[PDB]
């Protein structure tokens, strides 16, 4: 995250951090959708041009974390992965269409004040909320480096589809949307590399619930310069999510 503010304790209790085991390194964000299922971007797990092709035993997640560098005794939880499922039509060669993956935890995580699942959108919530100008939220650690670094938050407006299309060389698909402020400056917060895979959430005023509308897709460092971040459209991929969970 860049140009965010400090998240409050318990503010994003579905936030999941994905780590390489060896050597230990933060790879991506992710989200808790049940006590056993975690959502992330496919490119966090599989990106052949960079020799990236993780198996379950390569990885771990930490859940309930607020501070990047402080161990939070009795609060943060660690889990290993039973299985990774990448969308079979994930298009890593060209535009990262269907940039989505599911990870099953080896054992369920216990819910707490700090650990709690986010909702997947239903049709009416997606129809109501996925509109240009409406703001969603991304959370991650200060991809600016430093010392204390607690979870950061940025709230970003959904961008008009033609404006998105004109901002990039890539062929954008209906399975993606873009968010962020204009160059001429509404604000200047954004999701970064490292925030990739994390959730883009929106709060329904109708029922007071947080819904995961997007997954943070590809970013390099925090320089998009003139560009906008792209997000996997979770609702459009919801039947795939349900298929995987119901079968496995």
């Amino acid at each position: 995250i860049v140009e965010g503010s400090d998240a409050e304790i318990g503010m994003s209790p579905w936030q999941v951090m994905l780590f390489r085991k060896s050597p230990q390194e933060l790879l991506c964000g992710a989200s808790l959708i049940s006590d056993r299922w975690v959502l992330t971007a496919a490119h966090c797990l599989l990106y052949p041009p960079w020799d990236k092709n993780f198996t379950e035993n390569d990885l771990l997640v930490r859940i309930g974390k607020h501070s990047r560098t402080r161990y939070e005794r009795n609060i943060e939880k660690i889990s290993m992965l039973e299985k990774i499922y990448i969308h079979p039509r994930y298009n890593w060669r060209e535009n990262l269409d269907r940039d989505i993956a599911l990870m099953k935890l080896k054992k369920p995580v216990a819910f707490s004040d700090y650990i709690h699942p986010v909702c997947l959108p239903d049709r009416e919530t997606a129809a109501s909320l996925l509109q240009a100008g409406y703001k969603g939220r991304v959370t991650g650690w200060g991809n600016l480096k430093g010392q204390p670094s607690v979870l950061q938050v940025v709230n970003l407006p959904i961008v008009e589809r033609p404006v998105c299309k004109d901002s990039t060389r890539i062929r954008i698909t209906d399975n993606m949307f873009c968010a962020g402020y204009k160059p001429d400056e509404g604000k200047r917060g954004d999701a970064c590399e490292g925030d990739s895979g994390g959730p883009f959430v929106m709060k329904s005023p109708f029922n007071n619930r947080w819904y995961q509308m997007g997954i943070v897709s590809w970013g390099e460092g925090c320089d998009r310069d003139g560009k906008y971040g792209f997000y996997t459209h979770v609702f459009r991929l919801k039947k795939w999510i349900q298929k995987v969970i119901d079968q496995f």
């Binding site: 503010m11 699942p117 986010v118 969603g136 619930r209």
Partner: peptide
């Protein structure tokens, strides 16, 4: 699932976070 999206330290306690109003105000 039943309880999804309702945060123990916020919605469940009738407390709002510092910037959620920014989201709700954008939904015009």
């Amino acid at each position: 699932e039943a309880d999804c999206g309702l945060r123990p330290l916020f919605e469940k306690k009738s407390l709002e976070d510092k910037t959620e109003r920014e989201l709700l105000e954008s939904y015009i």
